[PDB]
Amino acid sequence: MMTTPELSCDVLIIGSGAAGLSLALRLAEKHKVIVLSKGPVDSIASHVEDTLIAGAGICDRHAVEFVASNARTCVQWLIDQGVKEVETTLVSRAQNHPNIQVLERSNAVDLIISDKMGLPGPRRVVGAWIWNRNKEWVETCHAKSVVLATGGASKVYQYTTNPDISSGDGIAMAWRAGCRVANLEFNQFHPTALYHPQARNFLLTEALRGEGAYLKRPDGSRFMPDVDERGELAPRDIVARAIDHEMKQLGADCMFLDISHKPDDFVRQHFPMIYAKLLDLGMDLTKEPIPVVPAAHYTCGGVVVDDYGRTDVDGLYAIGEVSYTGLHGANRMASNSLLECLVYGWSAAMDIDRRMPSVHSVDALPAWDESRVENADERVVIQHNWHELRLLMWDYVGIVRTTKRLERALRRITMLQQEIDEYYANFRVSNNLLELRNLVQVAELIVRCAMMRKESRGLHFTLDYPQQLAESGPSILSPLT
Ligand SMILES: N[C@@H](CC(=O)O)C(=O)O
């Protein structure tokens, strides 16, 4: 049962995006930090008002003012660290810091909570079990504090702009550890991702439509003027809903983006990189329409945190897209996702620093169960379930929602949960199984938040409740009820 941990640190940071790496640089000035990477590593007043408007009336004003007031000093700190040229600096710094150990190709399995090993005092995180992909075994990491910085949950959807950072593992682990989550119905979709077998999540920018690109049905006709007087210039969420409608109504695999009516020099001049990438895949931006589908892009909800980035579990923090701070409300304003992870990283660091002397090391932790069950055919079904989840979320908790579609999603999600419990119990850990467990867990939370909201607001659009409620707030789920 109890054994000496393979790994020990003062702060375990799960996730290696901008949020995780910038917090790592802050804390590693004083503390031993491990970073787990899944793969290779205007006035304040107007910002506040713009954020509140973007959030469609359910922003937490306290959080909005917190981020807007501290934005400039936290961005200056980032610049002084030596500044996606931000990622180049952060990755280089994190890999060359004496007090940071970057562990690549390692997946957190679950958080180790003190009350499950008879430690006295209020329950707190004391470490995590970690799947080492190169060694194919589960290790134990002792940590005095743990920070979730794993990104969002967009991978629950079959189309996603950034799959490698959107598996929802931080949200699922926090839920299993007893944390509230919130606002998981507010998922931002990019309207025009390239639909091609070798697209590698390539995005067609809205600048194409800004310069006059048309959005076409498979038969060549333009659908945007039929639904919005601004046509292809409508706001992002309106374009995404229209594409979703056309695809589902027509049973079409994709819509099409076409600038071919513009002269060829106009196209090559304004979008040289887009023109270059598409001809490499066999598509001519100056002659033919480009196949596009919407794609899940950003999770405005997540693990509930306070001003310090503290979750409901002592010692456990969450910053960046994995967290729900209240900053965003029902939608996202562009620049706020970076400001959020800098400001809450600063305040998390302050709290972690002040808390550290009171935390005493644990010299023995519960080892991972043997988990030796193996059936090769059942292992293949894990992949079927993974695809089934991502498709049902696209259909039933997608861009356009209805009450009856949400019911179908919850029914299937519940079935998958019960099957996972029944069929994969004590299965040997694998990346696919961990991802399936987490995707299904977070899908349940997403659909339960979407079902709670009896109105259309921001990123939550339901045909059954087209209007906004006069008074509203966030959708909060508790695992303790
Ligand atoms: N904090 C990053 C994403 C992340 O790593 O959570 C951003 O949204 O800018």
337 marked among binding-site residues: yes
Instruction: Calculate how far, in angstroms, residue 263's C-alpha sits from the geometric centre of ligand 1.
Output: 38
Is 221 known as a binding-site position?
A: no
Cα 398 from chain centroid (whole Å): 15
Q: What share of the chain is helix, strand, coil (3-state, %, to 5)?
A: 40, 20, 40
Closest CA to 424 of 375, 481, 363, 473: 375
Residue 184 in contact with residue 301, Cβ under 8 Å?
yes
Active-site positions read 236
| Cα atoms in the 13 Å half-sphere on the side-chain side of 57 | 9
DSSP code of 470?
Answer: S
Atom of ligand 1 nearest to the CA of 149: 6
Distance CA 461, CA 270 (A): 34
Cβ proximity of 135 and 408 under 8 Å: no
With tokens 């004083």, the residue in question is: 30
| CATH code 3.50.50.60 for 1-185+301-358 | yes
Rounded to a whole number of angstroms, the CA Rg of the chain reads 23
User: Helices H, strands E: what count in the chain?
Assistant: 14, 17
Atom of ligand 1 nearest to the CA of 151: 6
The residue written with tokens 């983006």 in the block is: 257
Residue 128, classed as helix, strand or coil, is strand
Cβ–ligand 1 contact at 151 (below 6 Å) = yes
CB-ligand 1 contact for 191 (6 Å cutoff) = no
CATH top-level class for 191-294? Answer: alpha beta
Strand order in the sheet with 476-477: 323-324, 302-304, 181-182, 476-477
Dist. CA 298 → ligand 1 center (Å)? 10
Residues ≥6 apart with Cβ < 8 Å to 51: 59, 64, 67, 68, 327, 328, 329, 333, 336
Q: How many other C-beta atoms can be found within 10 angstroms of the C-beta atom of residue 257?
A: 23
Q: What is the DSSP letter of 230?
A: T
Q: CB under 8 Å to 369, separation ≥6 — which residues?
A: 426
Nearest to 37 by CA among 130, 132, 102, 110: 102
| Beta-ladder partners of 194 | 292
16 is in an annotated binding site: yes
- Residues with Cβ within 8 Å of 474's Cβ and at least 6 positions away in sequence, in order, are 58, 60, 182, 183, 301, 324, 326, 329
Nearest to 54 by CA among 368, 458, 466, 472: 458
DSSP per position, 401-445: B-HHHHHHHHHHHHHHHHHHHHHSTTBPP-HHHHHHHHHHHHHHH
Closest CA to 171 of 431, 439, 422, 402: 439
The DSSP call for residue 99 is T
User: Does residue 336 have its Cβ closer than 6 Å to ligand 1?
Assistant: no
Closest CA relative to residue 141, chosen from 167, 108, 178: 108
Mutate to test the pocket of ligand 1, among 26, 337, 340 (most ligand atoms within 8 A of CB): 337
Q: Is 303 in the pocket of ligand 1 (CB under 6 A)?
A: no
State the distance from the centre of ligand 1 to the C-alpha of 350, rounded, in angstroms: 19
Ligand 1 atom closest to the CA of 298, numbered from 1: 8
Query: What is the sign of the dihedral through the CA atoms of 447, 453, 455 and 460?
Result: negative
Q: Where are the domains of the chain?
A: 1-185+301-358, 191-294, 375-462
Is the Cβ atom of 127 under 6 angstroms away from ligand 1?
no
19 assigned ligand-binding residue: yes
Tokens 């998958």 label which residue? Answer: 416
Tell me the one-letter amino acid at 175: W
> What are phi and psi for residue 218, nearest 5 degrees?
-50, -35
Architecture of domain 375-462: Up-down Bundle (1.20)
| Contact by Cβ (8 Å): 315, 144 | yes
Q: Residue 460 carries which side chain, given as an amino acid letter? A: H
233 is in an annotated binding site: no
User: Cα–Cα distance between 211 and 28 in angstroms, integer?
Assistant: 46
| Start-end of H helices in 137-168 | none
Sorted by sequence, the CB contacts under 8 Å of residue 241 that are 6+ apart come out as 399, 400, 461
- Looking at the chain, how many residues does it have? 481
Residue 398 CB less than 6 A away from ligand 1: no
Report strand pairing: 181-182 vs 476-477. antiparallel
Three-class SS of 326-350:
CCCCCCCCCCHHHHHHHHHHHHHHH
Contact status, residue 322 vs residue 152, Cβ threshold 8 Å = yes
Ligand 1 close to Cβ of residue 321 (< 6 A): yes
Which contiguous run of DSSP H or E holds residue 22? helix 18-28
Helix (H) or strand (E) holding 52: helix 44-54
Experimental technique used? X-ray
Helix (H) or strand (E) holding 294: strand 290-299
Strand order across the beta sheet in which 255-258 lies: 187-194, 290-299, 255-258, 214-216
Alpha carbon distance 440, 420 (integer Å) = 9
Alpha helices (runs of H) in 124-192, residue ranges in sequence order: 169-177
